[PDB]
Design a protein around this ligand. Sequence first.
Ligand SMILES: [K+]
Ligand SMILES: [K+]
Lengths: 45, 76
Amino acid sequence: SNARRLLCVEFASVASCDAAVAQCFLAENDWEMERALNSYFEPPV
Amino acid sequence: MQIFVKTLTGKTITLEVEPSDTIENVKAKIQDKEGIPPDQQRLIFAGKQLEDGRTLSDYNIQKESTLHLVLRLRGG
Ligand SMILES: [K+]
Ligand SMILES: [K+]
């Protein structure tokens, strides 16, 4: 969808990451972008 | 100098800061102007989350830079 492509572009821009990583963070978080970005930035421990 | 903080809702917050200001300082400024609690805020620049104790200079956040503001999603 145009929506999911946009969400992926925006994620990849904020995260400065590649599109595959961005898209899979999105898909694995029910396509919820702010939630997915929180997951990206929460440090591993 | 002015920097810009862009939310994921497309809102641009303009802040007046010095390079030597800490990230904790910046989050407090955002709370002052917008009401967003610092503990909710993740500030991002160049694809990295900014740490409270570091400075704008530490990250080479120059004047007219844009930070991204990602909000933690709790409760509710
Ligand atoms: K992570
Ligand atoms: K990154």
